[PDB]
Design a protein around this ligand. Sequence first.
Ligand SMILES: [Cu+]
Length: 120
Amino acid sequence: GSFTEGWVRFSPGPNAAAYLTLENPGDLPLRLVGARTPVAERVELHETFMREVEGKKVMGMRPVPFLEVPPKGRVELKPGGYHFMLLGLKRPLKAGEEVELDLLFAGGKVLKVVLPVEAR
Ligand SMILES: [Cu+]
């Protein structure tokens, strides 16, 4: 209905990414500021976006300080935009595995989630 629906990205190393649906069951807002996982030494929180250069449509990527989710609502990390970057892997991330992440939420909170690995 609601669903914690996502996938982690394919890579032997040194780095991967992750996309996943962030859902808020509370009456106050949640705020995803970092992650963790058993299959990377580090994780960073990023955006992906579109630029022009010379009239030529060309993409970009940056780190960001946090994501927000409003009460009773949801917002996803997605392939065309916001994502975790995983660095210093422990598994070579293949297609059709499963991996878990801790989602570090602002002010005394965490939500651990579990998701497949896709080559998408
Ligand atoms: Cu990235």
